From a paper:
The non-structural protein 1 (NS1) is secreted from the infected cell and is thought to be associated with disease severity besides its proven usefulness for differential diagnoses. NS1 can be found intracellularly, where it is essential for virus replication, docked on lipid rafts of the cell surface membrane, and abundantly secreted into the bloodstream of infected individuals during the febrile phase. NS1 is comprised of three distinct domains, an N-terminal hydrophobic β-roll dimerization domain (residues 1–29) formed by the intertwining of two protomers, an α/β-wing domain (residues 38–151) that extends out from the central β-ladder domain (residues 181–352) giving the dimer a distinct crossed shape. Here, we present high-resolution cryoEM structures of ZIKV recombinant secreted NS1 (rsNS1) and its complexes with three human monoclonal antibodies (AA12, EB9, GB5), as well as evidence for ZIKV infection-derived secreted NS1 (isNS1) binding to High Density Lipoprotein (HDL).
Unexpectedly, we observed that ZIKV rsNS1 forms filaments. Subsequent helical reconstruction of ZIKV rsNS1 filaments resulted in a low-resolution map of 8 Å, which could be fitted with ZIKV rsNS1 dimers. These ZIKV rsNS1 filaments are flexible and composed of asymmetric tetramers (dimer pairs) stacked along their exposed wing-ladder domain surfaces which possess complementary electrostatic surfaces. In addition, ZIKV rsNS1 at a lower concentration forms a filamentous chain driven largely by the complementary surface charge interactions of the wing ladder. Here, we provide further evidence that the recombinant, secreted ZIKV NS1 forms tetramers with a distinct ability to oligomerize into filamentous structures. While the potential pathophysiological implications of rsNS1 filaments or microtubules are unclear and could simply be induced by the in vitro environment, such structures, as previously observed by us28 and others, highlight discrepancies regarding the true soluble form of oligomeric NS1.
Author numbering:
A (entry chain K), B (entry chain L), C (entry chain B), D (entry chain C): 1 to 352
């Protein structure tokens, strides 16, 4: 708790005791290493799960998906060692990571033998097997969405003084729609508080009342935001959560904005996204009762690239509500083009 | 907002951005300028308060006593320019700081006079007067409680922690029974959370769904704890708040103890009270079905120096709750002497 | 070795792994507390030296004087336990320290028995004897300079998790004239190189040239600066070293300035000498080739404190050169008063 | 600079002023920008070099090769925008990185076109040209090493080096084979001295003499170690410098070990080479005078991977020297296999 505290705004070097949080979403690339636990038990789990008619796993976040491409060789070799013919295939995730009903069973006992964890686990290869245990990817045709597992892992301990934090995880014996709290946090001082998650960072201020300031989205989950680590969980609803609750929208006075509602058809397809309260270049948003009602988020740019400099709506706190996507700006549901037809603009992917 | 941390149980160090809280209950605040609005307006408060039957004040906290005392002499000189004859007397604060049905009014007009109230170069005095506005102490007869005010102040600024360190203030224009949220510090992470203010420190560990861990009291206020800043506002009663809400007992699951109720008869008199869950020296608390019922906290130390060692109770949980006061050790209401008469021991006067 | 970092010039906070120097010049007062290892062997060495004709020891560093003063009692008691007729008297510290031809011999064997000294180092009782194994002091008549032992010691271990990190020395097995490398640390980074040790602190930077900026001289030694721990020791002249080599002047480009010759006649009688390049208060220096020639340095004021305000220099580059001592503001030799008799100028004592 | 320090063998901790070194070899540093002065000045320099007849550039180090990989596209776009037709093509660094005799001429005047590409990070295309100003890569035939430049840049300033982490370079006016000192750190404390730069990490231990302890290499350059930035620069011979000076072998007694000689023919082709004084896995080294004389470094294993169990040496001192790279474990010149056919010994190709 002994800290370098140096007030950047006022240049105040100080130290003492308290609690400390750090912005790791941008520093995530060079801070984190992940892995499963007991790969033999995981081989037992995948084998047993295969006995339950399980296709694969549709990862909800990039953290888990990046895990499942780490012990694929070791998992396949362990399956080979005990004679289990099972090949795991891992593809690419696509936002918004949808909700899979199945859940990975938990073995009651490990495989009868196997000690490949000693020495060499990485540089291992084995021939494919007819059976495929797919992970993410565009294998929607190979198997439907109802045979895929989802949110069947946990974080018990992470962080190490080895320059590269190694994270311990294991298959859930429980069923949950809630996002993992081991890697979430917020706290408040005076006028400022912020909701922080590995794939979601949210800025909350107190200008007049407690409101929202900004949010960044690297990944597009489908779990639920908690209330225990949420501030002011008393007197708040889901519709005003600009972040959809189904998309893990916090239930706080700090997750609400005036003149705007939950955005379910937003650019939940974009791999990367940010919610900035700024008019996108060359686009001025108006507020007029004459304007149209809400509609699916339309990108600021037409397919031809021409920009639309006139956007309107009825009951918005002007001017901006635009998603900072890689492909451009997506505007909120209330904001709709004033003159450009709503069918001409790049409509957001169906992600309600 | 950029500082570091050095964990105790682990030597790992790392840092960047973050939010930070500090503890200032051990240091009993610190030397602060204590500008109440304007000293001329503060003096003009008492002319009309005194006129409408306010013969004294019951200070809510020790800060307030410091504040009135620190300007007591100057208050006598501000009113020398106009035909006002008052003399302010500030006495030691008796605990627990009972309430005052009156409040300090808010003058609407200023007295035309020199503005030398603040920053005077000394060399000035005032004329004493028979009528006395008694501020706490032993002026119960000189001023009835019904004519005393209380909790009639509101904090505005408490910054300038580098050089000026002024606790700027204003008479709260609003009759508030709750405490002031500004100087409160709190946050929760992992298995830990802790509230903090100018007179109290609170700890909360995720022992089993959170509970009461340890707190210290340097002053027994009689305000109330706001919910929008306390964890789990919903889901706790005021009776199981081991701190009576009357004493600003927080309304949170984190503020409660198994087998212990609100300690209304606790030693809220001892100017300082440290709340620790531990057997006091030389006492063995028992859990017997045949023990006695609740009662006012009996100090573990007798007036003659003898100490009653073996105590019992019917609904306790280890470790026992004993108020570590300068007066000695005081146990909870639930824990009574096994067989030594409660009359002989130093009973805690009913502190409701 | 990891650690914090704060560069106040840019406020750049850093943490990694490497080496960490410290500025301990101000901490010479109470940096260390210790005695030489096996004071019995040092007593044997002192007896052998005295038998060999070592009337005294000329302390080379104030650290050595501190150690000798601290260990005087234990050494005396060791001498008088074995029956040795020797009293070790440790005098004051006079600047500049002057060399001692002789050295402390390493004793072939320790004294037959000196266990009573074990655990009896500071609070040590003994008597006096006719023979005085003086240690520096104002005893030039008694033990002349040529008959004093000097720089015949070494350092084994220093630095610890304590304010007074115990230092263990050793009777130098052989001759030596250089200074101690173990307590030296240095390096260069961009535009700043600093030469620092237990008693000195020298600065340098590249202002279109690597020149001298400021040097703090708590003491005045005569050993030689080692090359193994020096920067840019290639192509530098003694006469341009503002600090002469005879007073332990580093041999580096960073230890010289332009338009100024070596200062061999400066206030080298000053106990504490700090060197800065800034105009002396209450005076001014002109670049006048008609000024005085080279010679002893002068104090800015007269004996009575009269401020000699008129000064000049043959070819100095403004700002001028002056010595800051406890005595007062002393000028460089190249600067002379435009109009002041040499009788009114205090000449810096010069010792060879 | 205010930092801290925590010991590893011990647990001593402390914070204070000083200077701090940081090892970025294993820590893998951070991302860097590598801005080459004014992009148009670089374009003019390369155009003038091509007019002179410079066919390409030899990236001395991996940092400069990454700089050219980051600067290629925008330089080509700038060239095509101006009346210039020359394409820059980069590739992979080949070890050992070879020298070049040419330097990029400093342009007299900037190319006549608009300035819009300060630190332009790609994302602009250009028309290919038959003429190519190849950079490193494998275009040896297209641009012979004769007309390949080498060390044509110098680091100027490291502005915003904590987060922005940008290294700004400019075309050197004068020729210089020397490496870059600004990115070199070193000092000595007690019995350890360490030499390192942006690419190299050398550990020297004092074991009865200042001796090397370990040497790790992530690249293979050909510049030269500056003397001002190393220790014990006297009484050192190249033959005992295990690292050849041609490999920027530091000139210090710390760079030599007894019983061995310079290794100018070792596995310097390795992209990563870690030198450890230890027997190669599955191999035994002995000291036999009848052993083969010094010869090219041989991988401990064979081409098929067979391990040589018996090894001999004429003058080696245990533990034996071995180069630990991804290719495998090697042996020095003095260490020859005791009895093994020379065909199966993977010689290190001569690095001339
Ligand atoms: C006697 C003891 O160790 N008690 C603790 C309990 O207070 C805590 O809540 C629990 C959490 O699992 O761990 C145990
Ligand atoms: C923000 O500052 C204060 C606090 O809410 C208020 O006066 C103001 O209206 C707020 N909004 C703006 C746009 O300044
Ligand atoms: C160096 O110092 C001189 C005068 O001492 C000053 O004019 C100049 O600006 C300084 N800086 C540089 C980079 O020369
Ligand atoms: C290393 O340790 C010390 C000197 O540094 C000494 O005892 C020992 O002999 C040295 N040599 C070896 C091989 O450890």
């Amino acid at each position: 708790d002994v800290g370098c505290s140096v007030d950047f705004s006022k240049k105040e070097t100080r130290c003492g005791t308290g609690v400390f949080i750090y912005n790791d979403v941008e520093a995530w690339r060079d801070r984190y290493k992940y892995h499963p636990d007991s790969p033999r038990r995981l081989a037992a789990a995948v084998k047993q799960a295969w006995e339950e008619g399980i296709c694969g796993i549709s990862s909800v976040s990039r953290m888990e998906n990046i895990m499942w491409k780490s012990v694929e060789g070791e998992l396949n070799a362990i399956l080979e060692e005990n004679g289990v013919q099972l090949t795991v295939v891992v593809g690419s995730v696509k936002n918004p990571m949808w909700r899979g009903p199945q859940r990975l069973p938990v073995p009651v006992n490990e495989l009868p033998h196997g000690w490949k964890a000693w020495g060499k686990s990485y540089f291992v290869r084995a021939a494919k097997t007819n059976n495929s245990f797919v992970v993410d990817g565009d294998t929607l045709k190979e198997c439907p969405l109802e045979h895929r597992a989802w949110n069947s892992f946990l974080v018990e301990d992470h962080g190490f003084g080895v320059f590269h934090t190694s994270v311990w995880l294991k298959v859930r014996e429980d069923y949950s729609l809630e996002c993992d709290p081991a890697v979430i946090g917020t706290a408040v001082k005076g006028r400022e508080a912020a909701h922080s998650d590995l794939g979601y960072w949210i800025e909350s201020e107190k200008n007049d009342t407690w409101r929202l300031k900004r949010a960044h989205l690297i990944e597009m989950k489908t779990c639920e935001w908690p209330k225990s680590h949420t501030l002011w969980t008393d007197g708040v609803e889901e519709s005003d959560l600009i972040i959809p609750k189904s998309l893990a929208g916090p239930l706080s006075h700090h997750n609400t904005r005036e003149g705007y509602r939950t955005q379910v058809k937003g650019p939940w397809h974009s791999e990367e996204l940010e919610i900035r309260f700024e008019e996108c270049p060359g686009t001025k948003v108006y507020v007029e009762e004459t304007c149209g009602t809400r509609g699916p988020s339309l990108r600021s740019t037409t397919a031809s690239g021409r920009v639309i400099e006139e956007w309107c709506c009825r009951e918005c706190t002007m001017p901006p509500l635009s998603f900072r996507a890689k492909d451009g700006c997506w505007y909120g549901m209330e904001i709709r083009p004033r003159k450009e037809p709503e069918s001409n603009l790049v409509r957001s992917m169906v992600t309600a």
